[PDB]
Amino acid sequence: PQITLWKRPLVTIRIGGQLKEALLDTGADDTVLEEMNLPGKWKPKMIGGIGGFIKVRQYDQIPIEICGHKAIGTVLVGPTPVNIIGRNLLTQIGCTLNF
């Protein structure tokens, strides 16, 4: 599909068993999800956005379907207002910018 940028490019994702709305975010190196209690091991991490840094939990090799396209990789979980799909997963679904 093609997604214009008139509005926030929000799409439906699936992770664990839980559809969510998430932002396709070319300016994000990583994928950051709103607080959720995912199973399995994780590592503490700091990530920095416009306001400064926040603490997150890094989970690896988590399957996540984005607009029906399967991906699997690292997801960071913490107090973000918005679910973010970053480049680590956008590449897996063959997403490009075009102009």
Place this chain on the structure above:
Amino acid sequence: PQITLWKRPLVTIRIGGQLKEALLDTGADDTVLEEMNLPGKWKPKMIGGIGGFIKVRQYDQIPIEICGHKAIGTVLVGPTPVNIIGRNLLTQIGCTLNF
């Protein structure tokens, strides 16, 4: 161009006569540049992301050339590690996401 996402989507922009590198960010509502001088009036504004809110200076109707494509719009100037081109200007240059 078509731009893939295995690296940060950085491009050269020209603004107020000067060349800068900037990040094409579909996650950003707005365009935020590192501290710099720009001509004309500005208004204080606040903007928020991961890690919270910052103060910026809002300049309206500013010409920027982004990877060879012209835009004229709102540019915020404030503390960021990265010049950011957000949707307000990505739309002007006809940028879409595709997968």
